[PDB]
């Protein structure tokens, strides 16, 4: 286990045996792909192979090393104000949890229909000094599921978190990083959906119907200050203890809008990664 | 207490590390995990399923479907050539393919590969193509004889319909790079007529062949990296 | 990982702490340690070796050697007195002595002490001194009778030559301070004539006695501190 796990030799690939010639009836190279199945032909079948003892692991080819990597999924920003502190909808952020709002990572998952996993988080506040001195600036990142008082403005009463989670980070102390189960509700996270809100010819339809894991509100405590600032508390997300069912084709066209699959540029007659050839005859 | 020494790396953050972090909402008994038909556990699996190849990688064709078919024609001449593509699995036409699309997530690749072709011809129709794998070393062959000299497979179109061509692994370095590299050049594969396409009366004289590529149990990748085949020259709205 | 709490003292630096620090050049097999005659392991050892005492702690004498001899004289009178010094081992004339020089590296001292005297007289010469230890309590005695009343030793100069006087440990506090302190006053020791210095014909009539002080197995020090007896009103060049 150790060795196999430390040496990373858990999932090893078979070796290529030796072959000889075959002047025989059954032709393995011939199958009818229309059966929708996949051929099973190998080196040893087609050629006169040798003998190679392999030693490549398919460890890094696991839904956990494919998925289990932190990725920016959101960049909370706060261009502070000292003029009006508080006021309505100010100096405190509130973004809707769930990806899409960021590429790269979004594309990765989407490789599968369903999915499930405990999510590990990590914050990365970055205090830009627009003043001649910032000093001490406390921060409060408080998560909030659905039906919950979302702060109207900074100092509501919802920032008491009497029963909510609020992580605090003060300039100096390392980067906060917490985890989180598989939330949701049923069995796994809908990587898509072909359902709607209802029969209302004005109902919603997409992977935004089965995922509304509330919102997360920020807010920079410390109160009023002299020299201004602007913050950008980055967000990374990692999937630990992940699962997968049923795969699907990657996404070649640059996405559109949040949620949704839509493809459709502002003219860009549309565009994909495929390159053009002069002729099939020469590559 | 414990006289400790804080080591250099301490306090950092790596998008690639295995460490625990406090829960956030203790005692949360997540929704049970019901049974669901078809769950993956390894990219590999996806890599072993043959996905179709864009090969008719030509001009107007390209944004359409045709971009997938290869019509086997007339051919006044004989022993003439059909097409060619190069093996470097991250190279349009290859790239976009379930495999390619993937491989482009890792820095290095290896093993054998499988190319399969199917005759969307007719029943009464007949043909015999010669497919070949020209290992790395020289130039994609200009002529059949020259190409027949290396690895190949004669394909007899018949009641079967699908011929699968294997691409042995020939390389110096146990491993090849997924990224375009003169060194790690995997070679070329090409197809030519062995005989012809003969059709008895009142049957069309052009027909298509679809082509595919799935992996071999040989196969394996490594060094994960972010993809090539997708630039989000966005953003993304709401 | 391990939920830890960083304690108050953490990150400090103490010129007096036992902690490990990473090597600097790993795998360095230092020069072997050959055998060398005479190695110390305890200050004590050095403290038990009698070093000579400056006592002729007088004016012009002082920068010279004489500053070490005590000439036993004439003495017209009788029962007259020789010298005195006080026991507080950090008090010139004592201080400078291998012992003193040392003790001045610690805050507290204790145990008995040994004073030894030697006759650099003649052979045919004769004498008898009375040495005495006047414990702490009163004033260094003005007269012999008064001093003879406490701890003493009559010394008969003869074929031997060295009389060693012990200074018992008399104190209230198991321990005494090395630093001048009215409380921790160890007392005085003085020397007087018992008889005289008689010399037969044509022999000098003054002669010297050297005096020394080594420790007793009684002895022991503590609370290391930086010395008294040396002010580097420098610096030090190149």
């Amino acid at each position: 286990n150790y060795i196999d796990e430390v040496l990373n030799e858990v999932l090893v690939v078979p070796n290529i045996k030796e072959s000889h010639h075959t002047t025989s009836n059954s032709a393995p190279l011939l199958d009818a792909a229309e059966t929708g199945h996949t051929s099973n032909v190998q080196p040893e079948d087609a050629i006169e192979t040798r003998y190679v003892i392999t030693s490549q692991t398919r460890d890094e080819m696991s839904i956990e090393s494919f998925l289990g990597r932190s990725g920016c999924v959101h960049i909370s920003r706060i261009k502070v104000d000292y003029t009006d502190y508080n006021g309505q909808d100010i100096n405190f952020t509130k973004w809707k949890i769930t990806l899409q709002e960021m590429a790269q990572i979004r594309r990765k998952f989407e490789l599968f229909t369903y999915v499930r996993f405990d999510s590990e988080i990590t914050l990365v506040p970055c205090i830009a000094g627009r003043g001649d001195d910032i000093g001490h600036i406390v921060m409060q990142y408080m998560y909030v599921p659905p039906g919950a008082p979302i702060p109207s403005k900074r100092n509501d009463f919802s920032w008491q978190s009497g029963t909510n989670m609020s992580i605090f980070w003060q300039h100096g102390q390392p980067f906060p990083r917490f985890s989180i189960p598989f939330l949701s509700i049923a069995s796994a996270y809908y990587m898509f959906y072909d359902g709607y809100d209802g029969d209302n010819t004005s109902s919603k339809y997409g992977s935004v119907v089965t995922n509304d894991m509330g919102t997360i509100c920020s807010r920079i405590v410390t109160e009023k200050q002299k020299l201004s600032v602007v913050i950008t508390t980055h967000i990374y997300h990692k999937a630990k203890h992940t699962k997968a069912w049923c795969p699907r084709p990657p996404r070649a066209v640059p996405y559109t809008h949040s949620h949704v699959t839509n493809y459709m540029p502002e003219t860009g007659d549309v565009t994909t990664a495929i390159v053009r050839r002069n002729t099939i005859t020469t590559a | 207490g414990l006289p400790v020494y804080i080591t250099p790396g301490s306090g950092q953050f790596m998008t690639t590390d295995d460490m625990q972090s406090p829960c956030a909402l203790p005692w949360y008994h997540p929704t049970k995990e019901i049974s669901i038909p078809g769950e993956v556990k390894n990219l590999i699996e996806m890599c072993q399923v043959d996905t179709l190849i864009p090969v008719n990688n030509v001009g107007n064709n390209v944004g359409n479907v045709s971009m997938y078919t290869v019509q086997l024609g007339n051919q006044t001449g004989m022993a003439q050539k059909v097409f060619s593509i190069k093996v470097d699995i991250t190279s349009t036409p290859l790239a976009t393919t379930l495999i390619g699309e993937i491989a482009s997530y890792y820095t290095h690749w290896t093993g054998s590969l499988r190319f399969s072709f199917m005759f969307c011809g007719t029943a009464n129709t007949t043909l015999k193509l010669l497919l070949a794998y020209t290992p790395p070393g020289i130039d994609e062959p200009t002529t059949r004889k020259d190409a027949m000299l290396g690895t190949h497979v004669v394909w007899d179109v018949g009641l079967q319909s699908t011929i699968s061509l294997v691409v042995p692994w020939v390389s110096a370095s146990h491993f090849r790079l997924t990224a375009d590299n003169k060194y790690s050049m995997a070679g070329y594969i090409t197809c030519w007529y062995q005989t012809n396409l003969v059709v008895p009366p009142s049957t069309p004289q052009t027909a298509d062949m679809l082509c595919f590529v799935s992996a071999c149990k040989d196969f394996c990748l490594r060094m994960a990296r972010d993809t090539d085949l997708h630039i989000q020259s966005g953003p993304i709205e709401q | 990982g391990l939920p830890v709490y960083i304690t108050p003292g953490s990150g400090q630096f103490m010129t007096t702490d036992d902690m490990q620090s990473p090597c600097a050049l790993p795998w360095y097999h230092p020069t072997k340690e050959i055998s060398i005659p005479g190695e110390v392991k305890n200050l004590i050892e050095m403290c038990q070796v009698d070093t000579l005492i400056p006592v002729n702690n007088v004016g012009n004498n002082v920068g010279n050697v004489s500053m070490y001899t005590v000439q036993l004289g004439n003495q017209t009178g009788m029962a007259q007195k020789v010298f005195s010094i006080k026991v507080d081992i950090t008090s010139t004339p004592l201080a400078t002595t291998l012992i003193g020089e040392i003790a001045s590296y610690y805050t507290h001292w204790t145990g008995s002490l040994r004073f030894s005297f030697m006759f650099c007289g003649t052979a045919n010469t004769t004498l008898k001194l009375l040495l005495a230890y006047t414990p702490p309590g009163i004033d260094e005695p003005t007269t012999r009778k008064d001093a003879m009343l406490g701890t003493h030793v009559v010394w008969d100069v003869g074929l031997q030559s060295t009389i060693s006087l012990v200074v018992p440990w008399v104190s209230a506090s198991h321990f005494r301070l090395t630093a001048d302190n009215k409380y921790s006053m160890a007392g005085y020791i003085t020397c007087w004539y018992q008889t005289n210095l008689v010399v037969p014909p044509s022999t000098p009539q003054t002669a010297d006695m050297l005096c020394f002080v080594s420790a007793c197995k009684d002895f022991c020090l503590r609370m290391a501190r930086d010395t008294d007896l040396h002010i580097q009103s420098g610096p030090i060049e190149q």
Partner: peptide
Amino acid sequence: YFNINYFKDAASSGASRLD
């Protein structure tokens, strides 16, 4: 060094294993 789930909940733990 391992299996020392310093934290109570399971959601908090390292990347799972492989089998």
